Amino acid sequence: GVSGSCNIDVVCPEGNGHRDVIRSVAAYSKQGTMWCTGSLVNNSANDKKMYFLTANHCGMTTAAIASSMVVYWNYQNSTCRAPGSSSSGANGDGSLAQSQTGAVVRATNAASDFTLLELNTAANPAYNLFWAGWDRRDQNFAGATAIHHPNVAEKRISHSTVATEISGYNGATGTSHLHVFWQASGGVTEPGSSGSPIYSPEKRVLGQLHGGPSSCSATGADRSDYYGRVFTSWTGGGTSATRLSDWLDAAGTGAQFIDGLDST
Amino acid sequence: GVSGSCNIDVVCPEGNGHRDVIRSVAAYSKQGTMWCTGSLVNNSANDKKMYFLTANHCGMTTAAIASSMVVYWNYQNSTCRAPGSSSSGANGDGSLAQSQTGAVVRATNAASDFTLLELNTAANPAYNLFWAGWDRRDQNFAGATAIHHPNVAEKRISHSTVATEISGYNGATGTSHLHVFWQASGGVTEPGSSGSPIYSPEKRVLGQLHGGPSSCSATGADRSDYYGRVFTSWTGGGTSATRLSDWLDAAGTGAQFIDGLDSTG
Ligand SMILES: *C[C@@](*)(O)[C@H](CCCCN)NS(=O)(=O)c1ccc(C)cc1
Ligand SMILES: *C[C@@](*)(O)[C@H](CCCCN)NS(=O)(=O)c1ccc(C)cc1
Ligand SMILES: [Ca+2]
Ligand SMILES: [Ca+2]
Ligand SMILES: [Cl-]
Numbered sequence: 001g002v003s004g005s006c007n008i009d010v011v012c013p014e015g016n017g018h019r020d021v022i023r024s025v026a027a028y029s030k031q032g033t034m035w036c037t038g039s040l041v042n043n044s045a046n047d048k049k050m051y052f053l054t055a056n057h058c059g060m061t062t063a064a065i066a067s068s069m070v071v072y073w074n075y076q077n078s079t080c081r082a083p084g085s086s087s088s089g090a091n092g093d094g095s096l097a098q099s100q101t102g103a104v105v106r107a108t109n110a111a112s113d114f115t116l117l118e119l120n121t122a123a124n125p126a127y128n129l130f131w132a133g134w135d136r137r138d139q140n141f142a143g144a145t146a147i148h149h150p151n152v153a154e155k156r157i158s159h160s161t162v163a164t165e166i167s168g169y170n171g172a173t174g175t176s177h178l179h180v181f182w183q184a185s186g187g188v189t190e191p192g193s194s195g196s197p198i199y200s201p202e203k204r205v206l207g208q209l210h211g212g213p214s215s216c217s218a219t220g221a222d223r224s225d226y227y228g229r230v231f232t233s234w235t236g237g238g239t240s241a242t243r244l245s246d247w248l249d250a251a252g253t254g255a256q257f258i259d260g261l262d263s264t
Numbered sequence: 265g266v267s268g269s270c271n272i273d274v275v276c277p278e279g280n281g282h283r284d285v286i287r288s289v290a291a292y293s294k295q296g297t298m299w300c301t302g303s304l305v306n307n308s309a310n311d312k313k314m315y316f317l318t319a320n321h322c323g324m325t326t327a328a329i330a331s332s333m334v335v336y337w338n339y340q341n342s343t344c345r346a347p348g349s350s351s352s353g354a355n356g357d358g359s360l361a362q363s364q365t366g367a368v369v370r371a372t373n374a375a376s377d378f379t380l381l382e383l384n385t386a387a388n389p390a391y392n393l394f395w396a397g398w399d400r401r402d403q404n405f406a407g408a409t410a411i412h413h414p415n416v417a418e419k420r421i422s423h424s425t426v427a428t429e430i431s432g433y434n435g436a437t438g439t440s441h442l443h444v445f446w447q448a449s450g451g452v453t454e455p456g457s458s459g460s461p462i463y464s465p466e467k468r469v470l471g472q473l474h475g476g477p478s479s480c481s482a483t484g485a486d487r488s489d490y491y492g493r494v495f496t497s498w499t500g501g502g503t504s505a506t507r508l509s510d511w512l513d514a515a516g517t518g519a520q521f522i523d524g525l526d527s528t529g
């Protein structure tokens with residue numbers, strides 16, 4: 001696929017500290033059309049349930065739509081194309097051969113733009129998946145990392161090396177979103193990246209991409225994005241079908257944050 | 265309620281040409297909290313069905329939430345506060361006494377950020393409602409008018425006097441949205457305005473507010489917004505639960521645009 005040249009192929013050295021959670025992120029189609037990003041999340045039972053977090057606005061919100069979605073793992077460029085280069089802006093060489101079809105909707109809620117699906121098919125060990133940890137604490141972090149499929153193209157990584165802020169969407173009054181500021185010439189996010197995770201420095205999901213002003217041409221404060229917070233989605237709309245808590249902590253261990261779980 | 269001072273009270277002279285469709289627009293609450301804007305739309309049978317168009321992102325998409333929503337009619341400042349004035353930015357004197365409760369979801373689709381509800385309670389003639397026309401044709405217009413409840417506060421009007429553009433949301437590649445550019449010192453839209461209609465110069469709904477960069481301090485290209493298009497929502501997700509066509513033209517007359525219907529007719 002094709003995305004903005006300023007983006008950074010996950011295989012680049014910028015991915016050296018994220019070789020586990022890179023394997024949590026997938027691209028997916030909706031009714032046959034490549035559509036959005038999501039990612040695999042661990043739960044407090046460490047049981048490999050195929051909980052797959054994405055964005056409500058992507059519309060994977062009905063049993064019918066979830067039933068026909070196709071999830072594509074390990075879709076990324078084989079080599080590190082120099083960020084900013086014509087090559088990086090060109091069609092990549094990623095494979096879409098490792099896929100699975102079908103899911104059910106466990107929960108969804110508009111306010112933090114989240115959807116939690118459970119994929120029908122158990123993880124194929126051959127795909128070498130990773131179930132990422134999460135952190136639902138009410139706090140900002142000193143930096144963060146996005147792993148995402150911009151334009152639903154090959155997987156990219158984008159780093160933020162400044163503090164997050166808590167706000168509503170687009171900086172409105174609120175606490176539903178984490179506002180993440182990208183580096184002046186670093187990777188950003190694009191339509192198609194929605195639903196992609198933002199990770200804390202300890203590699204725990206804090207939220208998933210809703211949207212924002214960033215693009216490769218964006219400058220200043222516009223080079224930033226908003227993620228619907230796990231903190232907010234945890235309690236969500238106050239029912240099991242509108243929040244994360246019943247799924248990510250079904251046993252009720254009271255975990256405020258957990259680590260990831262590897263296929264191995 | 266309180267909203268940005270650059271906004272324009274509907275009772276101002278700026279509303280002189282919209283005294284009908286002003287009466288289509290309402291504010292509503294979600295699980296008790298003032299939440300978003302919607303508006304009443306006519307259908308090809310001219311039968312006063314309480315079809316109420318709003319935004320999918322407002323989350324009025326489940327039976328439970330639709331059942332407990334409260335819709336507030338005729339919530340506006342009694343006098344024209346000068347746009348840009350401290351008065352305009354202050355709490356208004358609108359009333360929330362004329363309301364009704366409950367609806368069902370007829371259709372919703374994320375791509376054009378639309379939800380079509382049908383309110384449970386038939387129109388109260390005393391409320392003096394108007395069911396706006398609509399226009400599903402695939403085209404831009406030379407200008408447009410928004411009527412909305414910014415911050416779910418008193419009703420305001422915002423005029424665009426330049427051409428609309430067709431794009432995806434936030435100017436992305438696509439045709440799902442109408443991009444509307446506001447006047448340098450004119451009214452804008454704000455969170456809470458979502459779901460509010462954009463009207464063609466002929467006062468027909470073309471779409472409902474999704475979002476965008478505008479605010480009272482926004483400048484140039486940022487002083488603009490994106491509306492999910494009726495044209496797009498008409499066909500929607502290809503089923504009656506994901507599109508407008510089955511509801512707004514149940515009879516299958518083939519209407520490409522219709523005019524409004526007043527309470528007095
Ligand atoms: C849906 C997501 O892929 C995008 C991500 C944009 C990232 C830009 N830096 N979100 S969105 O805001 O563009 C959006 C929201 C709602 C709908 C219906 C479409 C697109
Ligand atoms: C939901 C709407 O009230 C707002 C309107 C903002 C208009 C700014 N000029 N839309 S939004 O884009 O800010 C938005 C979208 C999704 C969610 C969950 C919240 C807010
Ligand atoms: Ca508010
Ligand atoms: Ca039908
Ligand atoms: Cl695309």
Ligand SMILES: [Cl-]
Pocket residue numbers: 057321
């Ligand atoms: Cl949205």
